[PDB]
Scaffold this active site. Structure first.
Site, PDB file in Angstrom:
ATOM      1  N   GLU A 115     -11.966  11.943 -32.111  1.00  0.00           N
ATOM      2  CA  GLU A 115     -13.621  12.160 -32.019  1.00  0.00           C
ATOM      3  C   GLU A 115     -13.803  13.295 -30.562  1.00  0.00           C
ATOM      4  OE1 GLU A 115     -14.476  11.841 -34.861  1.00  0.00           O
ATOM      5  OE2 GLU A 115     -15.116  10.054 -35.291  1.00  0.00           O
ATOM      6  N   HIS A 118     -12.935  16.688 -31.286  1.00  0.00           N
ATOM      7  CA  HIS A 118     -14.171  17.242 -32.190  1.00  0.00           C
ATOM      8  C   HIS A 118     -15.189  17.484 -31.257  1.00  0.00           C
ATOM      9  CE1 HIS A 118     -12.910  14.655 -35.753  1.00  0.00           C
ATOM     10  NE2 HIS A 118     -11.825  15.308 -35.436  1.00  0.00           N
ATOM     11  N   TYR A 122     -16.808  21.465 -30.552  1.00  0.00           N
ATOM     12  CA  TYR A 122     -18.123  21.729 -30.677  1.00  0.00           C
ATOM     13  C   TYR A 122     -18.693  22.666 -29.236  1.00  0.00           C
ATOM     14  CZ  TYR A 122     -19.089  19.559 -34.906  1.00  0.00           C
ATOM     15  OH  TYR A 122     -19.124  19.051 -36.287  1.00  0.00           O
ATOM     16  N   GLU A 204     -19.811   7.994 -40.607  1.00  0.00           N
ATOM     17  CA  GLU A 204     -18.475   8.615 -40.766  1.00  0.00           C
ATOM     18  C   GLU A 204     -18.391   9.108 -42.365  1.00  0.00           C
ATOM     19  OE1 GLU A 204     -15.495   8.957 -38.543  1.00  0.00           O
ATOM     20  OE2 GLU A 204     -16.499   7.942 -37.222  1.00  0.00           O
ATOM     21  N   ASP A 237     -10.221  15.128 -40.474  1.00  0.00           N
ATOM     22  CA  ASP A 237      -9.975  13.848 -39.495  1.00  0.00           C
ATOM     23  C   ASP A 237     -10.913  12.742 -40.221  1.00  0.00           C
ATOM     24  OD1 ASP A 237      -8.120  15.128 -38.202  1.00  0.00           O
ATOM     25  OD2 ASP A 237      -9.542  15.747 -36.663  1.00  0.00           O
ATOM     26  N   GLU A 238     -12.159  13.026 -40.301  1.00  0.00           N
ATOM     27  CA  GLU A 238     -13.246  12.259 -40.775  1.00  0.00           C
ATOM     28  C   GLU A 238     -12.754  11.497 -42.001  1.00  0.00           C
ATOM     29  OE1 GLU A 238     -15.166  11.533 -38.554  1.00  0.00           O
ATOM     30  OE2 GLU A 238     -15.282  13.616 -37.383  1.00  0.00           O
ATOM     31  N   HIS A 241     -10.784   8.445 -40.866  1.00  0.00           N
ATOM     32  CA  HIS A 241     -11.758   7.577 -40.445  1.00  0.00           C
ATOM     33  C   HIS A 241     -12.659   6.734 -41.210  1.00  0.00           C
ATOM     34  CE1 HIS A 241     -11.888  10.912 -36.528  1.00  0.00           C
ATOM     35  NE2 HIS A 241     -10.808  10.541 -36.972  1.00  0.00           N
TER      36      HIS A 241
HETATM   37 FE    FE Z   1     -14.744  10.209 -37.159  1.00  0.00          FE
HETATM   38 FE    FE Z   2     -15.567  13.674 -35.642  1.00  0.00          FE
END
Ligand code: FE
Ligand code: FE
Ligand code: FE
Ligand code: FE
Ligand code: HG
Ligand code: HG
Ligand code: HG
Ligand code: HG
Ligand code: HG
Ligand code: HG
Ligand code: HG
Ligand code: HG
Ligand code: HG
Ligand code: HG
Ligand code: HG
Lengths: 340, 340
Positions: A115, A118, A122, A204, A237-238, A241
């Site tokens: 995360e 991520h 951004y 998520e 990736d999510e 998760h």
């Molecule tokens: Fe995630």
């Molecule tokens: Fe993420």
């Protein structure tokens, strides 16, 4: 109390996922739940660096966009950034002190780590499309339309974190602190955990995905393609998760891992149901602020609304909750090109 | 009083490294101390997968080793595994709740994550050189000799975590908890954090390196090649980690961060000194166990003691402390080949 290395030699294969003896040795040759080791492996195999994604043409694409479309793109981006900020630290601070099996402990740290990547992606995107990032980053903390879900999400974590401290410091019982009675119940703490997890599952599984549609709509028009490539990686990736949170929740409600949690989950099912609908409703209400100045190609208040209900039904069913919306096929099948 | 997303719009460039407002937005476009962003970037560039390292030749090597050499190798390995198990979770659980600048928050999470990769590398090594990893892993928890050398690490983290919980829950002041007077002083909590940091610095910069020497002693013999490649990779990461703690400590000492932390560093400098002296002695006392069944050419109690004093002086000088040991040249220059 919590310890970074429990001195008692224990069978890590027999401990519950949470509330058992703190994990001492980090070993990966065996596990009570294979799924968590598999997720760590998958997540590590997916490692990627934002900087290696060309986003040079996103700046011009953004400047050429109509004002309402700039609003849609940037508003969505700010919310994604908010969620990643919370998800980068929260799983660690909230779950690490309660985990009792090594595979889940390392999965959580790995999940949290991904995360933070991520979050870094951004920053990479923002720095390449606005010239002055500070404008964007500051409006994240104070943005009224965004700071409602943050409050709700952060609340679940904060309350679990607070109760966890009381549990570790005082243990179960009826205590007194500066003239006040403070009741510590493991049953309530367990419920609180079941609640962050359900809430995190919705975050998520629903909140992130709704934003992805918001993002890939541009990609479909060959715009903001740098951003698109990054979102594709984030989404990959999510998926991992949410798979992790779905297994945690299902293992907790089935009763095999901890009978008490199964009992507690059954008791608060109506609450979890409302919690999920609430999340979906917030995402729906957001569509308003997002399309207040108009909509765009292949995306509007109504379509997104339909997508939210579509995804929500799927996710809720995956964790044993009743379907809140009318069933129907994917409103935006084209999204599959960018997801799975 | 801890929150996963503080709602106050604050200037993250003006926050102290620790005890300020919890970090809300995770941004990487700017930083109070760019050294931490540089460290995150470097650590990410060093990403490696343990399982990719070929250790198939290690089983043959290991089994062919004289019994006392197997004892030396495995004992060293078990200690390293212990330290990585602790370092994989502790930075996150003990420091995360106290960090107030984004670059440091993510660096700690990245640092901790890399430690879990190290733990995974040891399972990979263990699983490939012995018949039953469980005997090795279980011995880590037990084995008074190993816990003897590590005594004080887990206990310090645990004390800090407990004090932190009290601080977040009750705040500064003198309280009454279950009829007992509990004092919560921020100044004292800062001291605890500061000394924990010095302790982790000794752990990262001394304890890990003395172990690398034992590991590379086999590499010098053309044995345990797989393990050797891994140790080189691990050492590369530890170099970033100790660079991180040295900077945290020296920045605090400079007075350019929290003014109170500069005062504390000065006031407890004898504590800092004593910590290293104690850690060095523990590393030395471990020699009697490591070589109980005999030593090796180029690796014995005397050489180990000489190296411990050598490296301890280097590390202590790096953070402004007086040298407790007589100065001397590197007793094992052959280690350079394997380091940096
Ligand atoms: Fe995630
Ligand atoms: Fe993420
Ligand atoms: Fe390490
Ligand atoms: Fe390290
Ligand atoms: Hg939560
Ligand atoms: Hg959308
Ligand atoms: Hg529930
Ligand atoms: Hg729920
Ligand atoms: Hg809707
Ligand atoms: Hg709808
Ligand atoms: Hg410490
Ligand atoms: Hg050594
Ligand atoms: Hg001090
Ligand atoms: Hg000092
Ligand atoms: Hg010596």
């Amino acid at each position: 109390a919590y310890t970074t290395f429990s001195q008692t030699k224990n069978d890590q294969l027999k401990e519950p996922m949470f509330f058992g003896q703190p994990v001492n040795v980090a070993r990966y040759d065996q596990q009570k739940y294979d799924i968590f080791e598999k997720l760590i492996e998958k997540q590590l195999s997916f490692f990627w660096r934002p900087e290696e994604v060309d986003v040079s043409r996103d700046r011009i694409d953004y400047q050429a966009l109509p004002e309402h479309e700039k609003h849609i793109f940037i508003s969505n981006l700010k919310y994604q950034t908010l969620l990643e900020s919370i998800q980068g630290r929260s799983p660690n601070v909230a779950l690490l002190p309660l985990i009792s099996i090594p595979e889940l402990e390392t999965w959580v740290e790995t999940w949290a780590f991904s995360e933070t990547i991520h979050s870094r992606s951004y920053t990479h995107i923002i720095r390449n499309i606005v010239n002055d990032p500070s404008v964007v980053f500051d409006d994240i903390v104070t943005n009224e339309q965004i700071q409602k879900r943050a409050e709700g999400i952060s609340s679940y974590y904060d309350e679990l974190i607070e109760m966890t401290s009381y549990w570790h410091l005082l243990g179960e019982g009826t205590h007194t602190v500066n003239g006040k009675t403070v009741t510590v119940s493991l049953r309530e703490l367990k419920k609180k955990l079941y609640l962050c997890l359900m809430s995190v599952n919705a975050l998520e599984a629903i909140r992130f995905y709704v934003s992805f549609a918001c993002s890939f709509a541009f990609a479909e028009r060959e715009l903001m393609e740098g951003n698109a490539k990054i979102i594709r990686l984030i989404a990959r990736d999510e998926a991992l998760h949410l798979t992790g949170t779905q297994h945690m929740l299902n293992l907790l409600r089935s009763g095999a891992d901890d009978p008490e949690m199964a009992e507690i989950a059954e008791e608060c099912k109506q609450e979890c149901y409302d919690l999920f609908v609430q999340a979906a409703q917030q995402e729906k209400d957001w569509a308003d602020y997002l399309f207040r100045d108009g909509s765009m190609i292949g995306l509007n208040k109504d379509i997104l609304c339909q997508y939210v209900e579509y995804i929500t039904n799927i996710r809720m069913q995956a964790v044993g909750l009743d379907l809140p919306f009318n069933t129907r096929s994917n409103p935006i099948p084209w999204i599959n090109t960018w997801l799975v």
